[model samples]
Target: HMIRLAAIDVDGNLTDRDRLISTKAIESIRSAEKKGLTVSLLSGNVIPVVYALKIFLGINGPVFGENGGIMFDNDGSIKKFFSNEGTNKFLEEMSKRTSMRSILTNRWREASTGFDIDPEDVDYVRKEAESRGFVIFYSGYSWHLMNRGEDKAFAVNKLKEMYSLEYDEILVIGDSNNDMPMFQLPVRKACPANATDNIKAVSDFVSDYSYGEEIGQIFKHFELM
Candidate 1:
């Protein structure tokens, strides 16, 4: 079997800024592609933002977003929108169900240092989800709610099928609690040291450094460059 796929996390892994990617990381990624590895970018950013990265990196694989949704194609196409659909539905339903005012704020506006969701909302959501046998992970701008039959792992499995690759040949690199599903894949997993403690605990390897250059080191470690 070939080392068919190299899935890199966009933010805090391939890029330094949320809106921009690093030239060094992009070059290393292109080098990996030159060696025939299918390069994929995974991020929590929206489709448009992720699309820019796909174009910048010259990657032609898959890009994931909004916690677990497919947002961009390697060939620079965008696909499978979720956040807007779900958010709209959620807002509608929330407005109907609660007496409290449900403000329709931009999802990214809720970002925080340790996790994305509001601390007050997070505590309440965690307890509510737990009582129902579900778990919620805060990813910086959104909260992932899962009990079963959901999550980024599910998305990754679908991506594997779409690309026609075995799970073992995939390399998932990420840096947040939202990336938990990616860590579930038994393929090689990596996280930067700046990643949350939970992410580090589950990662197969942790980069000693942070951001683009550190991720470049990881590419070299796998000889993808």
Candidate 2:
């Protein structure tokens, strides 16, 4: 049987600024689960932050982090290191060259601001990465220096390989520039009404609502109504 995985973004796409999930969206997820579908929370947030969300959403499946750099399996087992070791090393080297410091580097629990290297530094890093055929994604206040070959697409591909599932069996929903790589997949892609123009443009469908309500709309769209 094909498994339907809802790989959703957490912040703007699923919750309000106060971090509350919409009742409608929760209902939708519950409905989907009742139908034997699996729901996973994928976010840029660290493992601990996402863990809270997993509990709130009552999702026990895989959760991906750092734009898919880490994966938490269904049984709560975690894969912390990047999936592509070579690219990981390349990013480390690039950070050194640009003198870019990760806010997440020091204390994993302490959040940092103003520690990010400026755009010029990011540009330099990007240039170096591009020369090596890699691309970088900068979002919010963090810089994700990844090899050109590693991304949400790579993550999903790896998931498919490990699960023996086809691309069509998955449904990816997101609402930011970071979600672009995942949008490259052939499976259905959804974005909320608040999604950026770029994201809305590439999305297979856009939810007319916001937050959990928007997600609920997606569930109904897929006939889980």
Candidate 3:
């Protein structure tokens, strides 16, 4: 298969304006999965949200949570990245320096860390985290921190090994800068019209429509759905 795995980012790529998966998108996801393609959700969302998405997607592929910090399948097998004492202390240090409270998702995350900070303070938050050896970036929804040399691309590569899938077999779709790492993985890439300029610049194809309405266009372009 040219595209054995379709790694889609959730908030902007797959959700409607209200954040719900539209029936149209659901139809496309189901169709792709039925066609024997592995559909993985690459997201900064926490595990419970990941769990909910798995249920919503009704697919058995792995879910990359916390920007690939913790990856798990529908049956509970998982691959973890950060969460060692070193990073835990780093997380604690971050909290004290920035007062960037942990988002509710942290309760179930491991490989990556996320924070809710004022938009105006994002720069400071990023510098502080980076100076402390954390690779920090904003995910459209919030700022996420990972240990140096870690990112969604790192997690996707791990998934690639687990499934014996090739880079050409992966089609990564997203709409923001946080999805940058995955876009860098030498896979086929695309973005909805709502995607940021950063994403569009790197995408192999850019959809004219946004959200669920655009996925069908993407599926067609890739000859998947």
Candidate 4:
């Protein structure tokens, strides 16, 4: 199917090593929109931050934040995937097990939380969270603690249903392991050179270009530009 929407990951897909958005990426996204394709931001960040970027970037499609933990729409509506009860318990337990503070950005979060933990401590934290039936993962940006079924794919599925669009109508671009779930969807998938091996393996196109440099190429591949 022809692409009607481009759902993109923010951190690594659209930003460089310093987390700066390149001119080419912005130009490509705007060009895609000019061509009548929707561009959405799917990020492992909070809704407020994602929403702000959505405004600054001039993106017209919905925003999925916190890796599907929450969603924001153009009309200023918000949707949270899970309850705070499980997340609260998990946070309390994690705090007891390891002396940690919830990342400052988590104050606006409803479905999940993040911790700034040392890489060496990730294994222990991950295991501990899992043992208690919580989901934990590293996004290279933060240590995310979440609940089952609260994944990017889940949010994308909701988007699919909400918009009544087929999987083939969407093009999902991402990097990093956290983006793995969205790659699993039957939608057309792509990743930057910086993506994890597994993400590249599942992608329909693994660009030679990395970060925002690949957006134009992806649009070219799908004939969106």
Candidate 5:
């Protein structure tokens, strides 16, 4: 399918032992860009988390934050997609929301709201958000939420269109439960060895390796190199 663009989730695919990306992965990603491919970071992770990675790696492309509810464009513009139908209402009862063991990044977020919660304690909030139709996920570390409807694939599609890329010209990789939407998009897709069954089900390529190794393996398998 000849990928011209790749959208990736930061943590499980690229980040390593200390929750940071490894040099080898960074080098391979740089090689991909050097060989003429656009790579973007799409995550619930706030801007600085992924943006700094983008900047440090010398990769130039649209880096989306807030699970695709917003995007920081290649030319340096910010765009928003709606996900807040009843999110504020859900957040209004802050006491009901689970205590943040750790909130990923605050200053960097747009429409995307908290998480990373105890399900039993937070289900009320999740239920409310669900009734209002927001997106919530129970990450291995904590529960995370999106405003509603909007997700990584929303911005991925936008970026694909902005670049005039064909459906076949795209590749997306992720390992989180929240990454499901991006997998459903019409593109070449992958899940690493540690991927949740949900993520693996939608993948075009499921690699035997994890983290950076799986990415390299998938690149060769899909001819995305």
Candidate 6:
């Protein structure tokens, strides 16, 4: 099977704990592009940041940000999926109920928002958010609060439609709970060794390598390398 597109995650998949991309990852991405595959960034990062990475990395595919809340096309234009009114209202309510600090990156987010709270308060806040129609995701990086049903899969479908590609033509790689939605799509899926068990369970293959080191092996598995 020929894979035409690669939808890659950023944090845990492409970067290590210090948030650095590896030379091996860059080499693999370049190698895939040379072989006629389109490499794209589908990340929980903000649009500006993702776009910057897209420009620097020389990616020729669409970019999804804020866990699919927003998108940047190949031409550098943007598309927004939702309003933050409901999320803002919920944040207000959450603040009144408990001490919650907004994540700094929330400023760049247009769809959903996140916070940093004490681990002790996580369960209660998660329950409270759910009761009020919000979905909370801890991506091993931040606590993201989003409207239910807005996830990376939604953006992947959008990508598929925009590119006019079949599910089998796309390969998605990720390593966290937020990426779980993308794994559900009828596409080629893979993960790094650092991936959560839930992510690994649904994957076509879990690379023995972790972080950015896994990309080369994963691409090789699909013959994109």
Instruction: Please give each candidate's TM-score.
Output: 0.73, 0.76, 0.88, 0.93, 0.87, 0.93
* Model 1 lDDT, residue 146, Cα: 39
Tens digits of per-residue lDDT for model 2, 1-225:
243776777655777656666777777887888887777777655666667767777875677665566777777777764444444566456566677665653233222111356677766766766786666665433665554544567667666676667777777888787777788787677888888899888776798987667887887787644
lDDT of 5 by residue, 1-225 (tens): 688888888766887756667676787788778778888887666666567777887767888766777777777667777544345446546545455333646445667665545546566666766776675775323456666667776777887888999877989989976777778877888888998998888888899988677777777786656
User: Model 4: which residue pairs collide?
Assistant: none
Which ten contiguous residues of candidate 6 have the minimum total lDDT?
136-145
lDDT per residue as tens, model 1, 68-163: 554566455655633243333333443353331233224431211012344556566456546655455644334444343345676677678888
Q: Which candidate would rank higher by lDDT, 1 or 4? A: 4
Model 1 shows how many backbone clashes?
A: 3
**Cα deviation of 65, candidate 6, in Å:** 1.1
Cα lDDT for residue 193, model 3? 91
Residues 1-225, candidate 4, lDDT per residue (tens digit)? 999988888886888778787779999999989999998888778889999988888998999887887889868899887766766677777677565557788788888877776666678877777876778876636877888778888978887887799999989998877787888899999888878899988899989898698999999999999
The window of 10 residues in a row where model 5 has the poorest summed lDDT is: 95-104
Please list the C-alpha lDDT of all candidates, in the order they appear: 0.62, 0.67, 0.77, 0.83, 0.72, 0.83
How far does residue 61 in candidate 6 sit from its true spot (Å)? 0.8
Candidate 3 wrong stretches, greater than 4 Å: 84-88, 94-97
| Ordered list by TM-score, greatest first | 4, 6, 3, 5, 2, 1
Model 2: per-residue Cα lDDT at residue 152: 67
Q: Write the per-residue lDDT of candidate 6 for residues 1-225, one digit (tens) a residue.
A: 588998988776888768787778988898889998998787767889889988888788888887788888876689989767788777777788676667788888898887787877778888988987888876636877888888888888888898899999989998877787889899998999988899999999899999699999999999888
After superposition, candidate 1 runs with Cα above 4 Å error? 17-20, 74-78, 81-86, 92-117, 125-137, 140-150
Clashing pairs in 3: 69-111
Q: How many backbone clashes can be found in candidate 6?
A: 0
TM-score-best of 3 and 4: 4
Kindly indicate the candidate among 1 and 4 with the higher TM-score: 4
